[model samples]
Target: GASIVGSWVEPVPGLEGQVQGIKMEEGGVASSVNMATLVYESWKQEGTKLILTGKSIGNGQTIEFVDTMDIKRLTADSLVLDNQGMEIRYAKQK
Candidate 1:
């Protein structure tokens, strides 16, 4: 039930009103946040793998992740996303 801060739109279909709760740290470590709507997603899925090719509308650059099932509530630090049909995993927001 969270929302983006600026003029951005979710790309993914499933995440309608979800929000990205992010908490980043220095030293390239210790960052955590829950994944949310694809208001600015450029990810793809294939079989059991998910690939994030584009950057967030707000966040620049690009990233990816992988998983077995279509949707998964990651218990670990990251999540393996099967973006529709793309072969890649979207690292859980962190």
Candidate 2:
């Protein structure tokens, strides 16, 4: 089902302990801390593909940022995505 609808955070070793994750609402909207508190216009999933569209403010007058990634792994508490060569492992917040 829609198990991906929740708050996800990235775990980095030997890094500052801060909130760096994505908050996904029930709808097609989301907010990412990685983007320094940015709102997403829409987030959709088709098969294993997860697409996100948002507005980036720092890059000039709010440019539309579109990112498409694949859902490599998903479980009760783990969610992995194919973020180019740099893989992203996100864990669901309890």
Candidate 3:
């Protein structure tokens, strides 16, 4: 199992100042909106894909999406996610 137990941020230009990051703890404890947006509530890693689940702030409906990333690279310092014609680079913090 991969230890994604830290905070990840996108170093891209467009998504610079926003809640476009992820905070992951041990196991399946993860969230995308830790201090930004209330998007993903949790995450699960299936093979090379990261599955994200979220709940609606309005109601209570659940939503899920699978990130079909190519995983260009992942290390203690950086993480790369490339999928669906989009490539995003993330830097691990703490």
Candidate 4:
């Protein structure tokens, strides 16, 4: 029984190295950060639905997958974005 927030851009397969950001609007102004995009897919479970996610790093950016993903296990640090031709992961605060 928890909640998260943000632009939440989905991910795509094959395509990679995309720029994205998300804001954790649990309660208050909200905390946001930049991350990289990677390839991803979705999978359902017995009790939970999960969208497989990964990370991408290059140039001056690095992205990591979250834990709870609207898709499942899409954490604040990791994520799975697809059907959008890309994937995104919030790196960290600068």
* lDDT (CA) per prediction: 0.33, 0.77, 0.64, 0.39
Indicate which candidate wins on lDDT.
2
Q: Give, for candidate 4, the lowest lDDT window spanning 10 residues.
A: 38-47
Q: Write the per-residue lDDT of candidate 2 for residues 1-94, one digit (tens) a residue.
A: 4478887888545577754678777778887755553667778888898898887777457788889999988777878999676788888988
Question: What is candidate 2's CA lDDT for residue 82?
Answer: 92
Looking at candidate 1, what is the lDDT of residue 18? 60
lDDT at position 27, candidate 3 = 68
Of the candidates numbered 1 and 2, which has the greater lDDT value?
2
Model 2 residue-pair collision total? 0
**Which ten-residue region of model 1 has the weakest summed lDDT?**
1-10
Better of 3 and 4 by TM-score: 3
Tens-digit lDDT string for candidate 1 (7-70):
2112244677564433322222222234432222333334434233322333663444322336
Residue by residue across 19-81, what tens digits does model 4's lDDT show? Answer: 444444423232223443442222222234323334555557766554333343445544443
Name the top TM-score candidate. 2
Instruction: Give candidate 3's TM-score.
Output: 0.63
lDDT of 3 by residue, 1-94 (tens): 3455678886434565653577877766777634432465666665567655554454455445445456667788887777676877888875
The TM-score, computed over Cα atoms with residue i paired to residue i, of candidate 1 is: 0.23
- Residue 63's lDDT within candidate 3 is 44
Order of candidates by TM-score, top first? Answer: 2, 3, 4, 1
